[PDB]
Structure 1
Amino acid sequence: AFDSTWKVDRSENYDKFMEKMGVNIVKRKLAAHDNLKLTITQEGNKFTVKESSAFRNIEVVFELGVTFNYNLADGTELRGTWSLEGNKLIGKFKRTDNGNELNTVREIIGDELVQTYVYEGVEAKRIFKKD
């Protein structure tokens, strides 16, 4: 049951990614965790991501077996991949600065989701909740 409206509750080391990856604050303001909306619209071998925020907006399509894209000179650029194994999804990114590796594993911890991301020395976790 991935396809649905997802609203992040709490986060851990999220700021960590903002520094090591150099993620802007203006965009991170609501994307940090407090006011971040992560939408899931699984479509075939690709999942649509609709992000909702106060004034800012974000979105990124996903495809099992394809690279991630988040190039933003205004904030940061991260390119990786995304794949799902059974009931678990493992996304990834890579910084253009020096091709830094970034890993993310989202598991279904019952009625909630426990996210764990890592990026060269920077590992950030994130507990999820639904609207």
Structure 2
Amino acid sequence: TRDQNGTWEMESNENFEGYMKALDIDFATRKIAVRLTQTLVIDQDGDNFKTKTTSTFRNWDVDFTVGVEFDEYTKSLDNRHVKALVTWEGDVLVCVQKGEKENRGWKKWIEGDKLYLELTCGDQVCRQVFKKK
């Protein structure tokens, strides 16, 4: 389904280390980032999304309109400039972050009662599963 509204609680986190290493996040930060407990909160109204990802490590927020390119300066992560665009491929929400890293972005989808998020950078994929709270 395309409705990703909800408050979403992480139940698994695979290869988050590999993903952050592929973004060149420094080692000491990676040890402390990485939380198996993480809340994703999504407000979706037509093409407008407001998302907030929360954890005892960091709180972060990003708002976007599907189909409207937006510049990002990822000062909270690897400190790069990317051009981001979020679009639907069927019921999979696809973000590509164009810039230095290849294959950078993410895909997000609802399957059954759960939210699946696949974060990509270079050759690395991080898979996260959330249950609806």
Q: TM-score range by the shorter chain?
A: 0.7 to 0.9
Between the two structures, name the one with larger relative contact order (CA 8 Å, sep ≥ 6): 2
Q: 1:90 is aligned with what amino acid?
A: V
5+ residue gaps, structure 2, are: none
- For residue 38 of structure 2, what is the aligned residue in structure 1? 36
Secondary structure in structure 2 of the residue aligned to 1:54: coil
Compute the TM-score of the two structures, normalised by the length of structure 1. 0.77
Gap change, CA 1:91 and 1:42, over 3 Å in 2: same
Q: 1:117 is aligned with what amino acid?
A: L
Percent sequence identity over matched residues? Answer: 24
- Which of 70, 88, 95 aligns to 1:91? It is 95
Compute the TM-score of the two structures, normalised by the length of structure 2. 0.76
Q: 1:129 is aligned with what amino acid?
A: K
TM-superposition CA deviations, 1:71-92 (whole Å, max 9, x none) = 21x6313633211244321122
Deviation, structure 1 residue 55? 6.1
TM-superposition CA deviations, 1:86-112 (whole Å, max 9, x none) = 4321122245xx343314222222111
C-alpha root-mean-square deviation of aligned residues, in Å? 2.6
Secondary structure in structure 1 of the residue aligned to 2:4: coil
Gap change, CA 1:67 and 1:27, over 3 Å in 2: farther
Gap change, CA 1:113 and 1:82, over 3 Å in 2: same
Gap change, CA 1:85 and 1:68, over 3 Å in 2: farther
- For residue 74 of structure 2, what is the aligned residue in structure 1? 71
Question: When you count strand as a share of all residues, which structure comes out higher?
Answer: 2
TM-superposition CA deviations, 1:25-65 (whole Å, max 9, x none) = 648845x3412211101133220012222363211112212
- For residue 123 of structure 1, what is the aligned residue in structure 2? 125
- For residue 105 of structure 1, what is the aligned residue in structure 2? 107
Do the aligned residues in 2 keep the contact of 1:50 with 1:58 (CA within 8 Å)? yes
5+ residue gaps, structure 1, are: none
- For residue 85 of structure 2, what is the aligned residue in structure 1? 81
